[PDB]
């Protein structure tokens, strides 16, 4: 634990990145979190929504 | 079937050509939801219920 101060910095940033990446799995109300699935299923007028 | 006792046919393990239905002159209504009728032949489904 002696170098906890430096490890804390590493952990906070790694956590921030991991959270940011995981947000790409969120639908946010969309039919899918995967952009390619939306594009392959819907026409532009509906895909844009 | 009567609408109160509607029939459900489970379709699986087959090739589905939807353009035959969509390009037909014989249907008065053909409304797709959650999917484009012109992209159906490019999609795969785990199952289709008719």
UniProtKB/Swiss-Prot annotation, chain B:
Effect of residue 21 to I: In strain: Omicron/XBB.1.5, Omicron/EG.5.1
Superkingdom to which the source organism belongs: Viruses
Complex formation: Binds to host ACE2. RBD also interacts with the N-linked glycan on 'Asn-90' of ACE2. Cleavage of S generates a polybasic C-terminal sequence on S1 that binds to host Neuropilin-1 (NRP1) and Neuropilin-2 (NRP2) receptors. Interacts with host integrin alpha-5/beta-1 (ITGA5:ITGB1) and with ACE2 in complex with integrin alpha-5/beta-1 (ITGA5:ITGB1). May interact via cytoplasmic c-terminus with M protein. May interact (via N-terminus) with host bilirubin and biliverdin, thereby preventing antibody binding to the SARS-CoV-2 spike NTD via an allosteric mechanism.
Function: Attaches the virion to the cell membrane by interacting with host receptor, initiating the infection. The major receptor is host ACE2. When S2/S2' has been cleaved, binding to the receptor triggers direct fusion at the cell membrane. When S2/S2' has not been cleaved, binding to the receptor results in internalization of the virus by endocytosis using host TFRC and GRM2 and leading to fusion of the virion membrane with the host endosomal membrane. Alternatively, may use NRP1/NRP2 and integrin as entry receptors.
Full protein name: Spike protein S1
Species of origin: Severe acute respiratory syndrome coronavirus 2
Gene for this chain: S
